[PDB]
Design an enzyme around this catalytic site. Sequence first.
Site, PDB file in Angstrom:
ATOM      1  CG  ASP A 102       4.530  21.130  -6.289  1.00  0.00           C
ATOM      2  OD1 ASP A 102       3.861  20.709  -7.255  1.00  0.00           O
ATOM      3  OD2 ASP A 102       4.454  20.620  -5.149  1.00  0.00           O
ATOM      4  CB  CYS A 123      30.826  20.903   2.361  1.00  0.00           C
ATOM      5  SG  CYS A 123      30.638  21.218   4.136  1.00  0.00           S
ATOM      6  CB  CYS A 128      33.535  19.433   6.445  1.00  0.00           C
ATOM      7  SG  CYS A 128      31.894  18.987   7.094  1.00  0.00           S
TER       8      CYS A 128
HETATM    9  N1  LIG Z   1       1.861  18.835  -6.792  1.00  0.00           N
HETATM   10  C1  LIG Z   1       2.174  17.916  -5.899  1.00  0.00           C
HETATM   11  N2  LIG Z   1       1.527  16.736  -5.879  1.00  0.00           N
HETATM   12  C2  LIG Z   1       1.806  15.681  -5.022  1.00  0.00           C
HETATM   13  O1  LIG Z   1       1.194  14.617  -5.062  1.00  0.00           O
HETATM   14  C3  LIG Z   1       2.878  15.935  -4.056  1.00  0.00           C
HETATM   15  C4  LIG Z   1       3.176  15.017  -3.055  1.00  0.00           C
HETATM   16  C5  LIG Z   1       4.075  15.340  -2.061  1.00  0.00           C
HETATM   17  N3  LIG Z   1       4.516  14.682  -0.927  1.00  0.00           N
HETATM   18  C6  LIG Z   1       5.330  15.542  -0.272  1.00  0.00           C
HETATM   19  N4  LIG Z   1       5.859  15.203   0.904  1.00  0.00           N
HETATM   20  C7  LIG Z   1       6.716  16.100   1.663  1.00  0.00           C
HETATM   21  C8  LIG Z   1       7.425  15.403   2.803  1.00  0.00           C
HETATM   22  N5  LIG Z   1       8.226  16.341   3.656  1.00  0.00           N
HETATM   23  C9  LIG Z   1       9.343  15.627   4.343  1.00  0.00           C
HETATM   24  C10 LIG Z   1      10.195  16.594   5.129  1.00  0.00           C
HETATM   25  C11 LIG Z   1       9.366  17.353   6.145  1.00  0.00           C
HETATM   26  C12 LIG Z   1       8.178  18.023   5.477  1.00  0.00           C
HETATM   27  C13 LIG Z   1       7.368  17.037   4.664  1.00  0.00           C
HETATM   28  N6  LIG Z   1       5.491  16.695  -0.895  1.00  0.00           N
HETATM   29  C14 LIG Z   1       4.701  16.587  -2.039  1.00  0.00           C
HETATM   30  C15 LIG Z   1       4.439  17.511  -3.052  1.00  0.00           C
HETATM   31  C16 LIG Z   1       3.520  17.192  -4.061  1.00  0.00           C
HETATM   32  N7  LIG Z   1       3.162  18.143  -5.012  1.00  0.00           N
HETATM   33 ZN   LIG Z   2      30.545  19.210   5.265  1.00  0.00          ZN
END
Ligand SMILES: Nc1nc(=O)c2cc3nc(NCCN4CCCCC4)[nH]c3cc2[nH]1
Ligand SMILES: [Zn+2]
Lengths: 368, 368
Positions: free
Chosen positions: A92, A305, A308
């Site tokens: 990212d 896995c 398990c």
């Molecule tokens: N460069 C960039 N641009 C985005 O619009 C983006 C949008 C995003 N939306 C998420 N959401 C993360 C959701 N996550 C779920 C599990 C618990 C922690 C949060 N990560 C992202 C990363 C991203 N990275």
């Molecule tokens: Zn497993």
Amino acid sequence: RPRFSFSIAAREGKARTGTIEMKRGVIRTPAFMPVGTAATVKALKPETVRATGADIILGNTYHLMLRPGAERIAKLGGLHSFMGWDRPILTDSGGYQVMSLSSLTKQSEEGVTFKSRHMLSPERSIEIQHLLGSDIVMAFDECTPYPATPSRAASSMERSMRWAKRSRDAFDSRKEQAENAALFGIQQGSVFENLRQQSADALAEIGFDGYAVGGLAVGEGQDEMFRVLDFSVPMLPDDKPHYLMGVGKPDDIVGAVERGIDMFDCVLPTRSGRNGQAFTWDGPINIRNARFSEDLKPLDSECHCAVCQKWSRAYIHHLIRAGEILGAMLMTEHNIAFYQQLMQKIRDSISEGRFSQFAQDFRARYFA
Amino acid sequence: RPRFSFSIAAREGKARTGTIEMKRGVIRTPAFMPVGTAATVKALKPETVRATGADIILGNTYHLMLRPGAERIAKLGGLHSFMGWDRPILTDSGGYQVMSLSSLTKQSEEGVTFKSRHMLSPERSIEIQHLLGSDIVMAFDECTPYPATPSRAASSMERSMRWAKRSRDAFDSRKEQAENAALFGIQQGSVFENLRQQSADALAEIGFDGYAVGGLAVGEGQDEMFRVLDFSVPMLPDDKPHYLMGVGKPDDIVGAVERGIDMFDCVLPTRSGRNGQAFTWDGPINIRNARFSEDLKPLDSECHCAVCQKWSRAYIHHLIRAGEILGAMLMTEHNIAFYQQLMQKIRDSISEGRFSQFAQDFRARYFA
Ligand SMILES: Nc1nc(=O)c2cc3nc(NCCN4CCCCC4)[nH]c3cc2[nH]1
Ligand SMILES: [Zn+2]
Ligand SMILES: Nc1nc(=O)c2cc3nc(NCCN4CCCCC4)[nH]c3cc2[nH]1
Ligand SMILES: [Cl-]
Ligand SMILES: [Cl-]
Ligand SMILES: [Zn+2]
């Protein structure tokens, strides 16, 4: 091996399955990328990450530029050598994390300055990802907060599109990067169809190896996320991979694939594993619950896995209760393996033209 | 396979090398036992513990009787099945840990009552070790505090000897235990030669499969520990294994072998590994130190372990600084492997009649 070649082998409705071939390996799609933010997939050796079935992992420009540092990683031979993962890595760009984690930020047309004092910009982000030796480089963008007014979403998306062009130019200027890596653009536009369209148009005009749907999984909830995916994914070039950033729970993944997504990443299997949540085909369980204290069954009855095959719920319950590192290790390996098995079932079912039935069967059992 | 057979293959001075054959495997001596107090060698899968060269691990009656419980472990199939280690396990009897870790204790001729309210006695300790399925069962004793007056050491040692006989009788009464496991007695007597002799005499009269030197590594320091070993070890039966409980640093192990010890256990490699201390042939290093931030060398230049084959000091430094679980995993695997390589070098050098030279070379380099 090619720099980057995406092939779609089979389709069912909007869902696709195929492969991305890259110099460091093949990525089977739809793909789930375990997250390796601090240059480690937490509690797993890279060999174990591979053993679960992962083809590619995710790293983060923001975290690595702070610790241990991008120039330092390059001096040490690059991220692959540093952490001992020799397969593809997607990084990212910092666009999300700089705004999520920094104590203070200053945003401008040039980029973002922040306190961990550092700087990110399209050019610096692409340079950092070059120094890391990323295989899939993400454009530097802005993840619009949710909710946003149409006008705020528009100005944010427009800045991201200007940053997308700067990212493209920076990447293309670095011959070694352009020869060996791929560059993905990130669609923005919040929940608004017209803005998503303008964003898709801008990205396609520039041209990328793949297209991420950004700006989702930011609190909007599954119904809204799916509504936005319904119109947003078809706007992207059909012949390139579609990457939904930060998604998600197993049901989110299935629904997103039904809507044309090819790539996913999420901290859920790793993070929730450490916290005692195990994924199973009958839904998640919390292994800390007293009901598991004498349960000799594996975490999941079908899971293939190594965890398990060898250890009981009762043992893992004991480990997690005790705060033992091996508890975190076993839960994490199982959860990542579960996610990979989900992706394998998705791939196989699309290949066989029975994905709709798989999705139905999956939900009926997972949510019983 | 025999229940218990100790063979001495070679000697040099007081040092011996050989094997203990048991039903679940062979133990090469001198042996180092990784410690697995909470039914796990911290941060390692059992397969990894075996990969480092360990033949046997140590468990603890005291900890397991509290969590998850002795009857519970038996219901789940025994400690071996529970934790997935199929080779020999030696269990300490609780004699030391009850006094070291309990918030409150009441000591009497019957045994010790304590607050985690529970009870330990020779009979209960042996029963718990039976329920766990221990291969080497330790007698229930009292580790005399240091320093102790001669009279206090005498009364303490005498109680331990009465408890040793009760342990013998309890073990022998349980036919399955007597058929499949071994029982070790524990010598006490603090630092006093006459008491050590009386203790050795009492234990030999009862008769055990092996003899531990108890009551040391309790703050007396290496000079005093060695002084006591000088006269204490020759008092034990020559034809049975000699086990020094809770020792120790690499130099302690070498010196103890020079004094006739065959078996060791210590939390140092695991605990100090998690804390950032790595053992090397040039002495310990603290991997957190800034001097390692760009060091591409392995933890140790000669070490054959998987960690040293694959990862740099720089990477492990980063992991430990970041509080990453993989840091603990890699440091621990390396340290346990280092300890096993030390034991292998000790065994080989005694076998080849060059142990004296090895000890000299080891110290000159380790303490340079
Ligand atoms: N460069 C960039 N641009 C985005 O619009 C983006 C949008 C995003 N939306 C998420 N959401 C993360 C959701 N996550 C779920 C599990 C618990 C922690 C949060 N990560 C992202 C990363 C991203 N990275
Ligand atoms: Zn497993
Ligand atoms: N049953 C029984 N009896 C003993 O006399 C005994 C004596 C012991 N002495 C130690 N010392 C442990 C030293 N250790 C060094 C690394 C840091 C933690 C303490 N452990 C012992 C265990 C023992 N167990
Ligand atoms: Cl996430
Ligand atoms: Cl210890
Ligand atoms: Zn090593």
